[PDB]
Symmetry: D2
Subunit: 335 residues, 4 copies
């Protein structure tokens, strides 16, 4: 059994914890501690009640130095310097690094000095991380020697399962992505100073372009695609669930039904439960709280010559949270 801690009990951290309990602790993981600078009773309240993900169906209480979730005593800690955290004295196998402040292999390595064996960054990592993993696509690159890895981004976890079967079975010459994306807490309600002049604008009233690294990052996960994809994001006024819209030039002629069949076979085969195959006339909220990384919408496929468009819905919080647990197991399992 793998002993995990969560560094940063924000939205990502809370959703990882909820994902662990809501699936019946399918993974051989015990969350033995949370480190967060906020006070425990507020963080427990925000675990019990969420707007996007509703009420936690389990039980959460705070008892002394512990937050108790479905009977499990999770040690609460509040040290801003990771190397002083008692990870070694606590037997910590994997730190889920969810603060957003320690996204390089160097900064995230402080957890190793404090006694933890490994760290998974809940976001794209520096150039210098040991690996960048989309679980279901490249977790086989993991090795026992790795100690700081990145779990990529929500968007890369949607795109890579979509493009891998298509590149294998059809061939991707080049591609361009737009992700139509729910707003996030790096955005604002009404216009206010921001480093980025577009994210400074009300997220509730506008479509807001923003830069994405996900199309390029698929090159890390699928090296044969390095340099072949580019794109951007459009943030729109929804609280959760996003859409990858990928246009690509196929290397040979194809049809709508062949493209769809390739993805259906992948969803029943090696990408089962990571990639799903959807034919019903659904809308974005129907994928809220769906734990898949990539919900391919076969109803939206278009083919015009060699030009193909494919679209996939993803819960940009819940899919990623569940993948953090899958990657935790695969990392402790690497030889």
């Amino acid at each position: 059994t793998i002993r995990v801690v969560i560094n940063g009990y924000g939205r990502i951290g809370r959703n990882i914890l909820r994902a662990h309990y809501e699936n019946g602790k399918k993974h051989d993981i015990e969350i033995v501690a949370i480190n967060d600078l906020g006070d425990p009773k507020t963080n427990a309240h925000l675990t019990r009640f969420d707007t996007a993900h509703g009420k936690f169906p389990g039980t959460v209480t705070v008892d002394g130095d512990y937050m108790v979730v479905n009977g499990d005593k999770i040690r609460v800690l509040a040290n801003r310097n990771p190397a002083e955290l008692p990870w070694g004295e606590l037997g910590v196998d994997v730190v889920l690094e969810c603060t957003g402040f320690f996204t390089s292999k160097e900064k995230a390595g402080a957890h190793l000095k404090g006694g933890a064996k490994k760290v998974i960054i809940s976001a794209p990592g520096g150039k210098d991380v040991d690996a960048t993993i989309v679980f279901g696509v490249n977790q086989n690159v993991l090795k026992a020697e790795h100690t700081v890895i990145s779990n990529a981004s929500c968007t890369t976890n949607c795109l890579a399962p979509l493009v891998k079967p298509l590149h294998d079975k059809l061939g991707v010459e080049t591609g361009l992505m737009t992700t139509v994306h729910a707003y996030t807490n790096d955005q604002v309600l009404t216009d206010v100073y921001h480093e980025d002049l577009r994210r400074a604008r009300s997220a509730t009233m506008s479509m807001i372009p923003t830069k994405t690294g996900a199309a390029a990052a698929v090159g890390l996960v699928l090296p044969e695609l390095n340099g072949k994809l580019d794109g951007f994001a459009i943030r729109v006024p929804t609280i959760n669930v996003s859409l990858v819209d990928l246009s690509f030039v196929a290397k040979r002629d194809t049809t709508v039904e062949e493209v769809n069949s390739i993805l259906q076979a992948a969803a029943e085969g090696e990408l089962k439960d990571i990639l799903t195959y959807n034919t019903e006339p659904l809308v974005s909220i129907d994928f809220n709280h769906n734990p898949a990384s990539s919900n391919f919408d076969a109803t939206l496929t278009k083919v015009s010559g060699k030009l193909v468009k494919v679209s996939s819905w993803y819960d940009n919080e819940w899919g990623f949270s569940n993948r953090m647990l899958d990657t935790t197991v695969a990392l402790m399992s690497a030889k």
Copy 2:
């Protein structure tokens, strides 16, 4: 206006009301007088909706109802309510052009009822049936209009954004094939909370979801640019904004190009032949900054991507206001055709 084009609006829904607002808000720049509105609603309600709008704010002007007339900045506009266009007193009113905005008369056969009532021409504020005399994106193909054309289509808001964007690129680079997504504001064909609709996706709350919907607007470019017939297709994703939309076109160029070259082609078009129809934008703007912008296509050079021969270009458009202003442009072009 004197010895002017006399127009009437059939259907005073949002499209018709926004044509009237566009005409008055630029000071009747076009040599047009709106002399009647036919609509089945209470005239006092239609007058109130002209004074106050959520998306387009308060009308800068005066609107009163005085008997059988709605008076706008002093202009007396006859208010009618008849379901059958052939019974409308268009000959009596000396109508040059009916702006047909109901959605119920989109073929030449149906719209011809206005001509029976004595109007000289009809412009459908939407894609037309296969029998219409022309389909016009003003700035792109108004030169095809002739004096013989009597029932025409002004295409759609989305086609009016796409065609100015793709015409310069096709002329300089060639288009092999292209696929469009329009990320589009919701419209009144959608719903607040889930309820019966003919379309199972538009049956779903528009305020809470991204909602795919079909649109023929990319295929329709072939009616205005015949060299592109059959080469473009696409669909729409409706999102929770009240107005302003984004055309996102991915296409395969016939030769190699670059971000800078694509942007330069569109900059030249915006400064030249497509001035005021197509604009060129480099500032870090968001969709609401194009609300109440009368251009057809506000190209956003900051978003251009090129990977191999695949190009993505994106253009913002006020899906109500641009089209409203183009209806007036096309009215003048039609009446000027020789």
Copy 3:
């Protein structure tokens, strides 16, 4: 269910569909079987809208269309489509109670057409005409029901929130007079972007504004609590949320009271006679936390204010789900009446 109450739903709009969902989502807690739905829409569309909802999420269960039946968790529900209730085969189906959810048959005279078709009783999912046999807020006055009552009203969602809130306070403090504002989620009588409506305020975009609207729900308390007849009035402010509303009642008490005393009165009622109808809340919650809550009135003790003899009490309510569950409660009470 065996030797059960056989119900049908006339009108499968949101109100009717949410009754069906409420029945199945609590596992058919009530000894009721829904044996038919009459609606003019395509049954496959109505089935899809039962499986997926924005406000209430996915139905936890199965829904298929198999011939003339919609099959819900294995239960065969006959699907009908007839505009005239007197032609519906209610006698053939052994219907005990029609849940009348169309909005078109709210008087006893009109709803009596269901009785001509052979149903035994009708419950209108809305305020009734002056001729209905009873108006029921379950938990407050279901004891007035008699076996002779055949067409009744279940009042409105807002009356079902207000009456449980005010009944305990009137009993212990006395109400001289009261005025209510309900801060209310938008509904499908409103619009996404401004368009013609009979009401000039509901003609305006519901997503961008606070919109006042009339409601008789405070006056209607007098039908269920006659001692309060004529003492309460109010109106609604529609705001941009899809579901869950807030009753905000200001009233003048007949004796002096305090925040703590007011809260204690409502706590005792919630723990006693009004259990599960009225809840008592002290946690720092917001409206979405009451979405899909089946109570009629979720009193929020954190909001209580008293200044002199003026009291303000506020209660959250899922304006769809509470009422849906109460329709089922009132069905059982009506069929149990002696």
Copy 4:
């Protein structure tokens, strides 16, 4: 002519500046400097483009140490310690204190040490401020000796003009207010740690109660009402424009038309242009960018016995911004 500076060029500061220029500089004021920690080009961009208030109709450029607005050179400064600001060397008459960090008479007095003559706090002040002003209701309490005052809050500026004529002409025994209020930037897009557990919840999806001091603060402005009013706020998903809903026990019997007539007479008399009188069937967005403090909606009045309900719409940004300019003049004019 009064030489003004803006400390804190956030939303309040930007809207004060826009209000000055959009009304044709009706007030005998020159904004001679802005002090803000953000960089000038971002703040100029956010002056040119706003979501709630649209595009500034004037011209804004940055030229060296100055932001030029409609031809006026406004000195730009970036000192976080007010006493080091060159206010004296710059002839600063009134500092409009808009940071939200200096809301006591003591903390705000740092501007006086730096050489400014007076400070107006753009929010409720400490117990210790020299005065709390709702312009149009009590600006006559101002005196030459005052050096730190508060301009109250947006909500108090809506409520006080509403209640003053009613108390004078009818009599307010007691009252309770609900303000149905647009969200603000102290709220969040999706649930995240906050000091207040209700404001920690998504402002776009819920009605969110919050505490207000405005009903009590009307006691400062109208001492005869001290202790007689209480209330709270409900934040709802709109970006701007709010509603005061006041229920009160009148001291004598009255009617809907008398209540409305009292307010109509006040809107044409002493409260002209501060209080407006509205009978059209309007909704909240129709009052966006309206510079009044209190837009009374006569269509909503209710009277049941001695119990009266009156409602007033207010642009909670624009009305207050315009009042800051009115109060600036009245403060420099006090003898």
